[PDB]
Curated annotation (Swiss-Prot), chains A, B:
Native species: Saccharomyces cerevisiae (strain ATCC 204508 / S288c)
Domain of life: Eukaryota
Induction: Translation is induced by amino acid or purine starvation, or during growth in low or poor carbon sources. Translational repression during nutrient-rich conditions is dependent on four uORFs (upstream open reading frames) present in the 5'-UTR of the mRNA; these promote ribosome dissociation. Translational induction occurs in conditions reducing translation machinery efficiency, leading to ribosomes scanning over the uORFs, and increased translation of the mRNA. The rapid translational induction is followed by transcriptional induction at later time-points, independently of the uORF sequences.
UniProt PTM comment: Phosphorylated by the cyclin-CDK PCL5-PHO85.
Domain free text: Residues 89 to 100 and 106 to 125 define the N-terminal activation domain (NTAD) and the central acidic activation domain (CAAD) respectively, which can function independently to promote high-level transcription of the target genes.
Phenotype of the disrupted gene, per the record: Abolishes recruitment of the mediator complex to the upstream activating sequence (UAS) of amino-acid starvation responsive genes. Decreases RNA level of genes involved in amino acid biosynthesis and cofactor biosynthesis during amino acid starvation or methyl methanesulfonate stress. Growth dependent on amino acid supplementation. Sensitive to amino acid starvation. Sensitive to purine starvation. Decreases cellular glycogen levels during glucose starvation.
Subunit structure: Homodimer. Each subunit binds overlapping and non-identical half-sites that flank the central CG base-pair in the pseudo-palindromic motif 5'-ATGA[CG]TCAT-3'. Interacts with the mediator tail; the interaction with GAL11/MED15 is direct. Interacts with the SAGA histone acetyltransferase complex. Interacts with the SWI/SNF chromatin remodeling complex.
Subcellular localization, as worded in the UniProt entry: Nucleus
Full protein name: General control transcription factor GCN4
Full protein: residues contained: 249 to 279 of 281
Length: 31, 31
């Protein structure tokens, strides 16, 4: 479970980073 | 430990939704 949970945190961080990059992209469009 | 890990997942999920919402605003705002 511990292993499952670690995996989930790593999965979530990855998704988080993907979206943060997207926001940046859009932030530039915006300016 | 298990619970610190559960908490971290909860924290990242909430962050990911915050960013999803955000990306959705920006996108509408830009195109």
């Amino acid at each position: 479970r511990m292993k499952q949970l670690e995996d989930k945190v790593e999965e979530l961080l990855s998704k988080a980073y993907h979206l943060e990059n997207e926001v940046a992209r859009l932030k530039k469009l915006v300016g």
